[PDB]
mmCIF file of C-alpha atoms in Angstrom:
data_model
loop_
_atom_site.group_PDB
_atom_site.id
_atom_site.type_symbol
_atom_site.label_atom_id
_atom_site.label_comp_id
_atom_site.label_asym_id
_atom_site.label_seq_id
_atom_site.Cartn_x
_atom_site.Cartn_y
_atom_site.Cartn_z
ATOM 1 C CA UNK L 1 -10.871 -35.591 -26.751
ATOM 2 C CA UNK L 2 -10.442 -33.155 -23.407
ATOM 3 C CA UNK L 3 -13.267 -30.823 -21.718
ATOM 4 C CA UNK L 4 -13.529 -27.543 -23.099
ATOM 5 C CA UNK L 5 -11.106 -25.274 -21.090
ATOM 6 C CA UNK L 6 -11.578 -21.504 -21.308
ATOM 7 C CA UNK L 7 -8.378 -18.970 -22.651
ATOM 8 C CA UNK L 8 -5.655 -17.267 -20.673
ATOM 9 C CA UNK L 9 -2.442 -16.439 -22.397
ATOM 10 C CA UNK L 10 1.383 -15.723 -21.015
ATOM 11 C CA UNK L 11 1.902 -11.487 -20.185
ATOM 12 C CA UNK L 12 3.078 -9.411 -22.163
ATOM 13 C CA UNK L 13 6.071 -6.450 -22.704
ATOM 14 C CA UNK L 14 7.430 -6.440 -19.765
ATOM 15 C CA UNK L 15 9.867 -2.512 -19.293
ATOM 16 C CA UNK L 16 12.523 -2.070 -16.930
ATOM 17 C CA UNK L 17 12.985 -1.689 -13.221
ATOM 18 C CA UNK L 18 11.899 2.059 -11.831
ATOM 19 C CA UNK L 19 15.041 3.399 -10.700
ATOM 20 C CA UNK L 20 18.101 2.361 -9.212
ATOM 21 C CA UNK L 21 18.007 4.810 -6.038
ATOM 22 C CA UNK L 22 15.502 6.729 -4.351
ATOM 23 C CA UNK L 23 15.423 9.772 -2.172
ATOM 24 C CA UNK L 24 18.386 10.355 -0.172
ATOM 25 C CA UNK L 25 19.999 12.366 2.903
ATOM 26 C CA UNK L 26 15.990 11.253 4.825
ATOM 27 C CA UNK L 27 16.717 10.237 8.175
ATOM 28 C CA UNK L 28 13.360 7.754 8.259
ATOM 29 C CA UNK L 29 12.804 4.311 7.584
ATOM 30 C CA UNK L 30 10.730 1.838 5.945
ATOM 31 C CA UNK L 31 8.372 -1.036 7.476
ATOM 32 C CA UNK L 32 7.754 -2.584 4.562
ATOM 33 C CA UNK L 33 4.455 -2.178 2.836
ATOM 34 C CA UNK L 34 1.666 -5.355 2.204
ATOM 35 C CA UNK L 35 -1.779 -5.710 0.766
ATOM 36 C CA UNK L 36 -4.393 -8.124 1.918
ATOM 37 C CA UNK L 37 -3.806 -10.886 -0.699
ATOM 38 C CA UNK L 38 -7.344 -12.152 -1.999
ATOM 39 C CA UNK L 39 -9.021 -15.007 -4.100
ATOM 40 C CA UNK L 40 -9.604 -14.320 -7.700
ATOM 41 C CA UNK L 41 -13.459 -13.697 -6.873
ATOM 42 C CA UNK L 42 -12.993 -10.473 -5.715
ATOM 43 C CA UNK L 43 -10.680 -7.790 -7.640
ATOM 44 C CA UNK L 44 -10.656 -5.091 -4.578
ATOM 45 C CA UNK L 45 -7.939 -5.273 -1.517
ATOM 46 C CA UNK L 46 -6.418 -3.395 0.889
ATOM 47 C CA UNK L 47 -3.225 -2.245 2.562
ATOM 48 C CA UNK L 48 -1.990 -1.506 6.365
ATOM 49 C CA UNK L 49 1.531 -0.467 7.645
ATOM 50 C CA UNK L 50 3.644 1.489 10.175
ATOM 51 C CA UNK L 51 6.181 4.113 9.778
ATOM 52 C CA UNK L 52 9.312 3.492 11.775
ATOM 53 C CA UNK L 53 10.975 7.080 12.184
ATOM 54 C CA UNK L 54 14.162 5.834 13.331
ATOM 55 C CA UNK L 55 15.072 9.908 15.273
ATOM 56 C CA UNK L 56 13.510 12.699 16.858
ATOM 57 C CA UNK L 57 12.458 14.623 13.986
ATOM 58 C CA UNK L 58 9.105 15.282 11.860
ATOM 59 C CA UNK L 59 8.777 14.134 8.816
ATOM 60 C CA UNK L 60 6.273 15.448 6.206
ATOM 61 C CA UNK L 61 4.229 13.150 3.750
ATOM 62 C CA UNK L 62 0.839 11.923 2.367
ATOM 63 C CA UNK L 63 0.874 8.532 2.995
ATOM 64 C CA UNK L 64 1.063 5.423 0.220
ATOM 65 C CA UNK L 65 -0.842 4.420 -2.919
ATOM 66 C CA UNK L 66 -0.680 2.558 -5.906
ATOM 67 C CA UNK L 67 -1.693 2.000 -9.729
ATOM 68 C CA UNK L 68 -2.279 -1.593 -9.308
ATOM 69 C CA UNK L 69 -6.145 -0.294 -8.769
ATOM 70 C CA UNK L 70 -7.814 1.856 -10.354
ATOM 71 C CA UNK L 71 -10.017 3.808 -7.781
ATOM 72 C CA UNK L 72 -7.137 3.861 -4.123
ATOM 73 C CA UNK L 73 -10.012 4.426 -1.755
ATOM 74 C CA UNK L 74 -7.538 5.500 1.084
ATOM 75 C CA UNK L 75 -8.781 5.479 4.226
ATOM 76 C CA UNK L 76 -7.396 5.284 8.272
ATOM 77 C CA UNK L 77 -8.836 6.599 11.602
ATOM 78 C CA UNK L 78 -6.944 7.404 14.830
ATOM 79 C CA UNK L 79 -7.159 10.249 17.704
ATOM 80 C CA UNK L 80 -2.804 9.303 18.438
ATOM 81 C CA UNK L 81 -1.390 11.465 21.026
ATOM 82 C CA UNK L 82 -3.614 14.586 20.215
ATOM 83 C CA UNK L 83 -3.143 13.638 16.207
ATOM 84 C CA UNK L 84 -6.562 13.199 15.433
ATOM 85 C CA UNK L 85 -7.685 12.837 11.951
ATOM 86 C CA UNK L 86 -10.785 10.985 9.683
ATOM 87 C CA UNK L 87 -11.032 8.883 6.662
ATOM 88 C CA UNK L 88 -10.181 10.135 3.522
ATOM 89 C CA UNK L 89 -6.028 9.852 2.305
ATOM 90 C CA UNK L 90 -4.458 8.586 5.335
ATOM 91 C CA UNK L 91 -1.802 11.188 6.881
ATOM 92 C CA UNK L 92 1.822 10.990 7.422
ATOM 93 C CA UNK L 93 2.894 14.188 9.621
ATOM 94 C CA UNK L 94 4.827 12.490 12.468
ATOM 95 C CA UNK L 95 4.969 14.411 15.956
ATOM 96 C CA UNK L 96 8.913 13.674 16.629
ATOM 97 C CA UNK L 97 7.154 10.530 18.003
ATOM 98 C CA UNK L 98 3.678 10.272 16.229
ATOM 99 C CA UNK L 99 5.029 6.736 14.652
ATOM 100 C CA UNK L 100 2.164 6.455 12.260
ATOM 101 C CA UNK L 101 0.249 3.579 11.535
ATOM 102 C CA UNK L 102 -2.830 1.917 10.077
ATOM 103 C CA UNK L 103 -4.658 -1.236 9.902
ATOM 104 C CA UNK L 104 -8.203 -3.021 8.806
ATOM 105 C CA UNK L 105 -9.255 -2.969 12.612
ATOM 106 C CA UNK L 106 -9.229 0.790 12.957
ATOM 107 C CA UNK L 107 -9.560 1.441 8.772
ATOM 108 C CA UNK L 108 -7.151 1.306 5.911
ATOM 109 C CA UNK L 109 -6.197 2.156 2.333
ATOM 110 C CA UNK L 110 -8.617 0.059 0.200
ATOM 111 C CA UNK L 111 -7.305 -1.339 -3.469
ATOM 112 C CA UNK L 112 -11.043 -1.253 -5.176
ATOM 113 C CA UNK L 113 -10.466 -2.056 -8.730
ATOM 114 C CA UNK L 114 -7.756 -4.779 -8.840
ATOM 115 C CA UNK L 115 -6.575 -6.633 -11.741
ATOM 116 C CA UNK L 116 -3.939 -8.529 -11.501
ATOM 117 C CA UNK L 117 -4.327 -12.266 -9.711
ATOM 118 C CA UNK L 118 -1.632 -12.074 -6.608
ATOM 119 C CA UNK L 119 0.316 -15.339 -5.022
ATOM 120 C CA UNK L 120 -0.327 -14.950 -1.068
ATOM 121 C CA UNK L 121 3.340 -13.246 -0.358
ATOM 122 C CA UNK L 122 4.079 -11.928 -3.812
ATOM 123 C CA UNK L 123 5.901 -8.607 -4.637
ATOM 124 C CA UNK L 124 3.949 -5.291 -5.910
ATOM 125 C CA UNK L 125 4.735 -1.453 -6.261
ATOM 126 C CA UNK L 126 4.059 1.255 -4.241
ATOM 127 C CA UNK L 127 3.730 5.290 -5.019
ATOM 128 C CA UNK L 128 4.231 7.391 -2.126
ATOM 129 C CA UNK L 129 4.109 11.151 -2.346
ATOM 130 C CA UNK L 130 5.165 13.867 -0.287
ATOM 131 C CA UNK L 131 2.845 17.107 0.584
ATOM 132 C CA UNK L 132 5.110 19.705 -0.335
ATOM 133 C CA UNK L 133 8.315 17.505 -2.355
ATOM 134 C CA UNK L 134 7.568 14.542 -4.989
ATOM 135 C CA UNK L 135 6.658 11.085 -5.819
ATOM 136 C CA UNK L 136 8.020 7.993 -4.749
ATOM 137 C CA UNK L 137 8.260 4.415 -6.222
ATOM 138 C CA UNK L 138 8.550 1.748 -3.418
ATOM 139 C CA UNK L 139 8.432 -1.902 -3.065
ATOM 140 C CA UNK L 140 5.509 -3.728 -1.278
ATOM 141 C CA UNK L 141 4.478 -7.323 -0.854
ATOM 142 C CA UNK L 142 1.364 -9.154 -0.132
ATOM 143 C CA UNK L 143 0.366 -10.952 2.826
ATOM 144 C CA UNK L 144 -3.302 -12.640 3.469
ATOM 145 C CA UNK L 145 -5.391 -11.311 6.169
ATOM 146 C CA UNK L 146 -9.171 -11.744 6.880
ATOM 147 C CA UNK L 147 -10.387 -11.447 3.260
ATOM 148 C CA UNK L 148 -8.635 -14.093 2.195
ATOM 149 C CA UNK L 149 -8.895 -17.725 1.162
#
């Protein structure tokens, strides 16, 4: 005889991978992407990032999400060098130089509705989107921070 253990089950389907390019000809480059990995407790998270434009020249955007929760409470503050904004979507207009960022110490892009259990440094999609263009799938991984243990 054991103790009575509860039910989980392997996944399931699987599909395959998005697509094997993205956009190209955009002189701008990619820092990465990571969400605040979490204990099983609590199905909400968050993400924080950078954006690296690697020449002189402004790029037009929204900023990232994802359908790995299913309310992205997006959020960010900053006054930058005159780009001043407040929370709701973060922003990604870059003045030639306006490298944006965001982080949980000045506010962030919060995952509330989670649903999947992550590993610590596992690998998970980003959406993009541009104001005035498309969509974009991207890669993303998790790291801890704060939240987390």
């Amino acid at each position: 005889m054991g103790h009575t253990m509860p039910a989980h089950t392997p996944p399931a389907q699987t599909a395959p991978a998005a697509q094997k390019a993205g956009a190209q000809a955009l002189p701008v480059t990619v820092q990465g992407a990571t969400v605040a990995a979490v204990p099983p407790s609590i199905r909400d998270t968050a993400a924080y990032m950078t954006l690296t434009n690697k020449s002189d020249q402004p790029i037009k955007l929204v900023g990232a999400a994802t359908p790995l929760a299913t309310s992205p409470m997006l959020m960010t503050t900053t006054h930058s060098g005159g780009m001043a904004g407040m929370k709701m979507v973060p922003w990604l207009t870059i003045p030639a130089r306006g490298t944006l960022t965001l982080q949980r110490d000045g506010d962030h892009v919060m995952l509330m509705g989670l649903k999947r259990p992550l590993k610590v440094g596992e690998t998970v999609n980003i959406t993009l989107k541009a104001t005035d263009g498309r969509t974009l799938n991207v890669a993303a991984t998790v790291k801890k921070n704060i939240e987390g243990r």
